[PDB]
Amino acid sequence: ESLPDLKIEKLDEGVYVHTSFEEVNGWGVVPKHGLVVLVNAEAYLIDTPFTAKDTEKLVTWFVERGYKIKGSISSHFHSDSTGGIEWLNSRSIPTYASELTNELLKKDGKVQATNSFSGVNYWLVKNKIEVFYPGPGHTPDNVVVWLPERKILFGGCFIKPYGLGNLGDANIEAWPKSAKLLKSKYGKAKLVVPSHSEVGDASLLKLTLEQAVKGLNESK
């Protein structure tokens, strides 16, 4: 009835932070950040909004300012990251997903991305966008997206300094190990964009690490 409208804010050179909302069973509504990275005249969707409406608005807002949407990539199989894939597929816009996240969607009777990748890393665009997989954590497929020439890290729902959040499809045992490996590879971070918290810096990495180890202990 009353849910904030899609917000698109500029983050750096060609990087935009997009936020959509959705009523789940928390203290009500919960915001979710994603990103549009502009390479040249080509935009890329790092995670999509929860719905087609928000995904349709986001796309056109960029197409309006003369940018062709080259594709999207989802961080994990959940909805704050895969909802708008459907809309995108019908408009036949290249959609990407990890082979584990596309398997998980399938499992849930959800439409699948039209492009898969595997391995510890994938260059969506060779020297500008890397997708890294530190290992099971928030969910078992969650990936992280790295912006080389800007030191920005999109860590979606994996990065959660203040609270682990939805433990639904977690791997509490391994989150600490992945959280540790992630702090190592990309500690060279300028910015770190969580899915449900204010933008940060290398510190959100150490925070989620303690947050995760505590979660592991706090269960045994």
Catalytic residue among 18, 32, 54, 80: 80
Residue of 208, 209, 191, 189 lying closest to 200 (CA atoms): 191
Q: Is 111 helix (H, G, I), strand (E, B) or coil?
A: coil
Report if residue 141 touches Zn ion, rule: CB under 5 A.
no
| Alpha carbons 157 and 205: distance in angstroms, whole number | 12
Question: What does residue 197 show for φ and ψ, rounded to 5 degrees?
Answer: -170, 160
Shortest Å distance, C-beta 136 to Zn ion: 13
Give residues 14-73 in contact with Zn ion (rule: CB under 5 A). Answer: none
Can you say how many angstroms the Cα of residue 127 is from the centroid of all Cα atoms in its chain?
Answer: 19
Considering the complex, state which of residue 74 and residue 112 has its C-beta at the smaller distance from Zn ion: 74
157, 164, 179, 207: residue in contact with Zn ion (rule CB under 5 A)? 157
The reply to whether 18 belongs to the active site is: no
The reply to whether 89 belongs to the active site is: no
Report if residue 78 touches Zn ion, rule: CB under 5 A.
yes
Q: Helices marked H in 83-174 — which ranges? A: 85-90, 101-107
Report if residue 100 touches Zn ion, rule: CB under 5 A.
no
The reply to whether 102 belongs to the active site is: no
Shortest Å distance, C-beta 78 to Zn ion: 4
**Is the distance from CB of 6 to CB of 57 less than 8 angstroms?**
yes
Kindly list the residues in this chain that would bind Zn ion in the complex (CB under 5 A): 78, 80, 157
